[PDB]
Amino acid sequence: AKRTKKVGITGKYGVRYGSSLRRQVKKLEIQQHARYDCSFCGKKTVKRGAAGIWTCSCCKKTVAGGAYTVSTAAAATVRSTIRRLREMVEA
Template sequence: MFSTGPNELMGIIAIDTYRDNLYRSCLYLTIRKSAVAKRTKKVGVTGKYGTRYGASLRKQVKKFEITQHAKYTCTFCGKDAVKRTAVGIWNCKGCKKTLAGGAWTVGTTAAATVRGTVRRLRELTEA
């Protein structure tokens, strides 16, 4: 049917070689990808504790550590740049202000209650 000349055979060989090299590079990438360290599925930040201390305690600690290491919005400049420096001390990297807050989060429930009470009393005295 079709006559294959020497140039057409060279083209087929070149395509096969290209396909073979492509397969090798894909195989290499697959092997390299699996060499990357696998991340944790559930434990997250508490993976450093391994199997110690029990699952329920590690879940509680996970909740505290996530809130402790999170960035919070600064009440002065509005940036998400407030990080915990020490227990109860929070520092904003945007405006360089230091705030007093809770041990795990910037705001505490007691502080929110006091803020609401002060606002309510202020509205009563103004009215």
């Protein structure tokens, strides 16, 4: 059953540290520990370990990415920014 009302994984900190900080961390540490899809395998097997480091479980290909998610939004728009700048110089 749904054990906790609103803390979830943050219940490991129990009582302490203030409710505002725990509401921030709960937003992050889910993304720290969630699985993700491989762009190479195609399998939901991407895992962080030692932040900034994102391996797929299968095929052992490993992508350097953000600290708490695979791609941050920041480099995500940089990719298309390059894609614009690449083909502008191509043509």
